[PDB]
Amino acid sequence: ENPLKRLLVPGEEWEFEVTAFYRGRQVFQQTISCPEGLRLVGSEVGDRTLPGWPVTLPDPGMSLTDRGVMSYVRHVLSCLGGGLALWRAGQWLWAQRLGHCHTYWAVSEELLPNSGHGPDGEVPKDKEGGVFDLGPFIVDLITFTEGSGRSPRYALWFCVGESWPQDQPWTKRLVMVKVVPTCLRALVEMARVGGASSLENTVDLHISNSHPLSLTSDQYKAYLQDLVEGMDFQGPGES
Amino acid sequence: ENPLKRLLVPGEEWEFEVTAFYRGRQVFQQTISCPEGLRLVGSEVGDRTLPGWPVTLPDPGMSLTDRGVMSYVRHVLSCLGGGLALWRAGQWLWAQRLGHCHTYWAVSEELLPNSGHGPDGEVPKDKEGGVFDLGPFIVDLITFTEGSGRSPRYALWFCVGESWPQDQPWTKRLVMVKVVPTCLRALVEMARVGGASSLENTVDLHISNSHPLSLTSDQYKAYLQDLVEGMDFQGPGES
What we know:
nucleus (chains A, B); homodimer; 21% helix; alpha+beta
């Protein structure tokens, strides 16, 4: 009876908002839904040959003037190949770099992350790599509704560099693509808005075959608690 | 020429979305249009006796269980009389309390936040009282499209209490009614979506005798700039 468990029902499709930035400037945005997820590509020639919805990054000639940056971005569109794949399987979001560009990822806020101290890791090519687990996110969301914890992050940032092994793209972050599972942005909003008001709030999970839901703060909290029973959490001493 | 000025053409009719809440729970929703505005009432025996479209608030019997709360709400429905009147005249939204219930108002978010703050004021009965001015809204809206300001608020909240002067309804907020001029909700979103793609965007003003509009961010911004000239803004030290 938990409406939130729909997030994990077999066949449910999440909506992914993709926003691209060249040198920190937004040059593209598209929201997609696909069972096999999506693939960030630079060319449409070999668009739908592989599984996953192809999202084509635009030629920089239509957004910037800096020739030095323009050259780099075109080199990146060139190594993309099959592309950066991102998809969901259960409570996990997986990524895999199918082309030739060294691509790095990080979970962060909705703002383009600055250099800081590096990305969370490099997206693997030989095998899939886990980049987000809904379990800990929901646990942290529950903690947020209790005031003892801040708003949990849900934005995935992918820094795409060249095929060259020496290139250190995270430093300048010239090609950045944010992917936001809109259901997670909504869950945080529901918590942020609903928690500060006694009035019933409405939530749109932005998932397939679903309608917005009006819930009181106590109902939402009880549903988050039960949703936790719908996911895996590894024990300290468990294999 | 400027399609947005249709919002102010003589005879034009805006659509108002009315949503009522009892003890924080949504119990009614209706969208209405009428040149003489609307009137929130508790009985249908004295509806169409005064100008304004009567919007009847429902018996709490088919939504509430707490006897304490139900008694209070029924008392409120009993003082409404002529009702809470809300209507538009040019760029202003006016309200007047024709019945006996002390009624307080506030312009806020789509969901009214709880706070130690009082209402923006009490709706007067002796005369009409201004509750919303499109002028400042549009100016703030423009500031918003420039990233130099937050998204302007457009949701009107009316807290309806009993006739008793001692009653402090704004504290428990048992009977709340939200009124949203959907054209304003649409204008704010346009300012948000327009920033996602410089191309064409559709904005439905939800007003009479008018088709949805197809505009670009540049056109929308220019029309907002010109719309300002169609409204009054009191100058410093002006009568």
